[PDB]
Structures are given as C-alpha cells and as structure tokens.
Amino acid sequence: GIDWSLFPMKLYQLGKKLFWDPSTIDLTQDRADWDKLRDIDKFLMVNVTSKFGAGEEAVALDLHPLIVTLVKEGRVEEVMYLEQFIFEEAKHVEAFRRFLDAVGVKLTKDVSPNYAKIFYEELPKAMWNLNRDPSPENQVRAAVTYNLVVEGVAAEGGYNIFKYITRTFNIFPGLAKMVNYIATDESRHIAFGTYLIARLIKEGGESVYKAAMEHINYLGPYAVGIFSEPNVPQGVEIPLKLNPEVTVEYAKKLLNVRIQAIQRAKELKLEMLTPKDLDVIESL
Amino acid sequence: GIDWSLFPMKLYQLGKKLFWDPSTIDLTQDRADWDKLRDIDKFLMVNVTSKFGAGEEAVALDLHPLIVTLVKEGRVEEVMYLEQFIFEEAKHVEAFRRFLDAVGVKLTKDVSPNYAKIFYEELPKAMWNLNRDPSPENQVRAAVTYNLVVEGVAAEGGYNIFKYITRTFNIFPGLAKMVNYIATDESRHIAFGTYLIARLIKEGGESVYKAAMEHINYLGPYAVGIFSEPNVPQGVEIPLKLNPEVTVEYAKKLLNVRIQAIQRAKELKLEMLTPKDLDVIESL
Ligand SMILES: [Fe+3]
Ligand SMILES: [Fe+3]
Ligand SMILES: [Mn+3]
Ligand SMILES: [Mn+3]
Numbered sequence: 001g002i003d004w005s006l007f008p009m010k011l012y013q014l015g016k017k018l019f020w021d022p023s024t025i026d027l028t029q030d031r032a033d034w035d036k037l038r039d040i041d042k043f044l045m046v047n048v049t050s051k052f053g054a055g056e057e058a059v060a061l062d063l064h065p066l067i068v069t070l071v072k073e074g075r076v077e078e079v080m081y082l083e084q085f086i087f088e089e090a091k092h093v094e095a096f097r098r099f100l101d102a103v104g105v106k107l108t109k110d111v112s113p114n115y116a117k118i119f120y121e122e123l124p125k126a127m128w129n130l131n132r133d134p135s136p137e138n139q140v141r142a143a144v145t146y147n148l149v150v151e152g153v154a155a156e157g158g159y160n161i162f163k164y165i166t167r168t169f170n171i172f173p174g175l176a177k178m179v180n181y182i183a184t185d186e187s188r189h190i191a192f193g194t195y196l197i198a199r200l201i202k203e204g205g206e207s208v209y210k211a212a213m214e215h216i217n218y219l220g221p222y223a224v225g226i227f228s229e230p231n232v233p234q235g236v237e238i239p240l241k242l243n244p245e246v247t248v249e250y251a252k253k254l255l256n257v258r259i260q261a262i263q264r265a266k267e268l269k270l271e272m273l274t275p276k277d278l279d280v281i282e283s284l
Numbered sequence: 285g286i287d288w289s290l291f292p293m294k295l296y297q298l299g300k301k302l303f304w305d306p307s308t309i310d311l312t313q314d315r316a317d318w319d320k321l322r323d324i325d326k327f328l329m330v331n332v333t334s335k336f337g338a339g340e341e342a343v344a345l346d347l348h349p350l351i352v353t354l355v356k357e358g359r360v361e362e363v364m365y366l367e368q369f370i371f372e373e374a375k376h377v378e379a380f381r382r383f384l385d386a387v388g389v390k391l392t393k394d395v396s397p398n399y400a401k402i403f404y405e406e407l408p409k410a411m412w413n414l415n416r417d418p419s420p421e422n423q424v425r426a427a428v429t430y431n432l433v434v435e436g437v438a439a440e441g442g443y444n445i446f447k448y449i450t451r452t453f454n455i456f457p458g459l460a461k462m463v464n465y466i467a468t469d470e471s472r473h474i475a476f477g478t479y480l481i482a483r484l485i486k487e488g489g490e491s492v493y494k495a496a497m498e499h500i501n502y503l504g505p506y507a508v509g510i511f512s513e514p515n516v517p518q519g520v521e522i523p524l525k526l527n528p529e530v531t532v533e534y535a536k537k538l539l540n541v542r543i544q545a546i547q548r549a550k551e552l553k554l555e556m557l558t559p560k561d562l563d564v565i566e567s568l
Binding site: 001002016019021023059060061063067068071076080083085087090092094095097098100101105106 | 300348351364367371374379384388389390447
C-alpha cells in the first residue's frame, strides 16, 4: 500500500538513480597532495573534515527517534526515505573517514563552542525530545535542527570551504569528487526537510509555524559562529588563503534562505510537488 | 586509522561487491502469480511476508543501542559494518514491501505468540538493555538474539519456506530472486555475529560464554515455535503443500548449528579469519 506519487517517494527513487559509493573513488593523488599543505593548512583541513566526520555521524545516530516517531504514525513513505537518508549520512561518514585514512590522520568544545552547541547539545536535545513527547512542535524543531540548520547551513557552508580549497590550489581531486556527490545527496535531504516542515505546518497550524521560526532563530547565531572557529591561536598566516569574512557571510545568507523556506512552507502545494520545484540536483 | 585487514572490514568490502537493489527486480509476473493462489495460500503468503517485513524492520530499528555502544568503545571497524548491516536490513524491508505492494496487499500475538515473544519482547529487551548497562554479557545476549536467533533460525527458516513454494509451483520469480539476494546479505550478517560473539567471549572469559549459551537455550523453543504458527484455525487443506514437520525440523537443526557456533567461538583464530572460513557466500 505504497503511494509512489508522494513527494518522499520521488526523492527516494532519485536517491536510487543518483547512487554512489566512496570506495570507488581514488585517493592516491589526495595522499600526495597532503604533502603540499603546511602545518597550519593541515590543521584547517583536519578541523573541517573531523567536524564533518563527527557531524554526519551525529546526524546518522541521533535521527533514530524521528524514524521511530513516523513509523508509529504509519507514515511508510516518509519512513522509507529516512532509511535512505540515514544510510547516505553514514556513507558520508565513510567518505570523510576514507580521506582521513588516506592522508594518514589518526571537537574540542573549548576551541569550538558553536560546533559543540549544535551537534553535541542542540541536535541530541531536539531529537531525543521526541522520545519524551512526539508532538508536531517537537517534530518541526527536530526537522529544523538536523535538516535546515545542520545540513542547510553547517554542511552547505562546509562544502563552500572544500570547493574553494580544491579549486584554488588544484588539490585533493578525490575529495572534490566526494564533496560533489555528498552535496547531491544533501540536495534531497533539504527538499525532504522542506516538505516535512511544510506538512507539519499545514497540519498543525500556527502553533507549528511559530515553533519552527523560534527554533531556527535561536540556533542561527550558533550555526553561523561555527565558521568563526579556526584552529587554536590563529597565528600570522591564514590557512589555505581562506577569506574568513566571506566564509561567515555565506553561512549568514544560507541561514536566511532556510528562514525564508519556513515562511514559504505555509502556502506550499504538496501534491503537485516535484524535486525541480525545490531546486533539487537531478543528475550526477 | 582504519584497519582494513580486520574481519568486519572484509565483510564490509564484500557487502559492497555483492550490492543489489530491490527496485531493479521486476514483479510483473509475481502479480500475475498472485491469482494462482487460493485464499488459504494467500493467507500463508501474507503470514510469512508480513512477519519478514515486520521482523526486518524490528531489527533495523532495535539495533541502534548496539551501534551506539560500539562507537563509545571506539570500535570503528565494527561500527562501519553495522551501518552496512542496518541499511541492508531496511533494504530487505523495502523488498518485502514492494512484493506486498505488487500483489495488492494493504503479528496478531494471539495467533503468533512465539513470533511476538522474539520480535516484540525479547529482541527489544536484549537491545535496549545496552542503554541500561552495555556490559560484555549484555552485548553477547544482544548478538545472540538479533543475529544467531532472529537471522540464523527465524530468517533462515523463513527462506526455506519461500524457496519450497517458488520451486514447487514455479511462481513468484521476482520474490525468488529477492530471497536469494537477501540470503546473500544475511550470510555476512551471521559471520559478523559469529565474530562478534567470538571477540566478546575471548575478551570476557567464561562469564560471557555462559551468557551466550544461556540466552540461546532460553530463546530456542520460541524461535522454533515460530514455524508452528499457521493462519487462524487451520482447516482441511495445508496451504501450498507445505510439510509442517519438515519446516519445524529445519529450524531445530538451524538452532543446533547456532548453538555449536557459540561453542566453537571460544577457540577461534580471529586474525586469520576470512569469510570462507565462516561459510560466507562470496558471489551473487
Ligand atoms: Fe545530509
Ligand atoms: Fe539479516
Ligand atoms: Mn550528510
Ligand atoms: Mn535482513
């Protein structure tokens, strides 16, 4: 009794068409490119990649209450997509772990408080609050946290950091290929979160809409502050010629795009919804 | 810092080589074959397939505490394989759900007490006891339950039921293809459970070995009784010419094979371990 015309199933079949595996990606050149990086460049690299490895793992693990919530409500279509969502997240964890393994590399809170606030406090709190009370308001706060904030701002802003480094120095071709594939999966993740927040709001009314706008405003400063957390004492040089103002500015603009996506979710036609309507990448 | 020579990573790369997706399997003939079944045959079919759909979903969901336990212990290799394990389980849920959807079909406890004892009481109890106390004894009881019992006896005995029906009546070619692929994944699931029980016993001593033997003996009668639970009042005819004694006898023998696998796990060389040493299917 599956409705294949539902929007989650559209993204579900898309995730199957655009399937990839990080074990088929050669990291030989990436290992050679590791020697091209100075110590302050390697620190910046480990900083971001480990926050990706740990963040994607936090999402893959902390998303268990939402899936249990939806299966108790008998929403088989949305449960089937979250099962694809979770595996893709763990697939992203493998991708970053294979890169760290290839370069020979074997979360402080004290130097990264914004990152810890999101992934170690606010993400597990919003998710495991569903075990306490799976209300529509807690479900929209969960969706806002892991999807629009963790992925829509933190992950997407991280992608911008990787793309700048790979094109500026012509390094890490395997990682650049990984980020493209990861950003493709994440495109469907944002669309499902937009749809999910749309369904909760259209079924729960103004009470659900307020909870989404209050939660994303509350998380906003921490999500943007994630990109103001380089390594330790800075030093004289900026690693890998990054522009700190543009990195932070991009996240702020991402945050506003996610805020406006909640405002547009009130009046959104869910039945005629297609991935192209949510600007979803439909080709690898 | 991944050890690719470890036994979990061997099965991990095997799961990637032997990857399959149930959406590429044609069920057109299966829908036509549904009309070949009498009402008592359709009931038997829905009986087993829904217990598979619900059982595989119970395993995919209730396995969250074990993965959280292993990541807190820093066992990255075993966590990476459980991530493949969980997705394959949800992939099995999709396979059975696509078959039920193709045949147009849209767990009673009262008529299936043995099935409910395993999947609705003993499986969630052994798994969520890790959240209470992730001791080595609780970890081996968890492994015995979901792996050696749920998969080694219940799932494997279910496969025997499907294979008999498909070859006796020459029906359901899509389902027969699915069961072959599912039984291939499950081959690696049993090997990892054997390895995991072996590591816990060799690191925990006699206390862990006793917990594994006490738990599988306690679950044994319920696992075998699962195959003594046809539909409702039986009637005059046996559905699909099944032999009830041979179906039950096969499960009993499966149970003893799993018991002897725990006894052999005490003296098992884990470093030289290969999939062929655990009789793992290595080709599709
Ligand atoms: Fe994502
Ligand atoms: Fe299995
Ligand atoms: Mn991801
Ligand atoms: Mn399975």
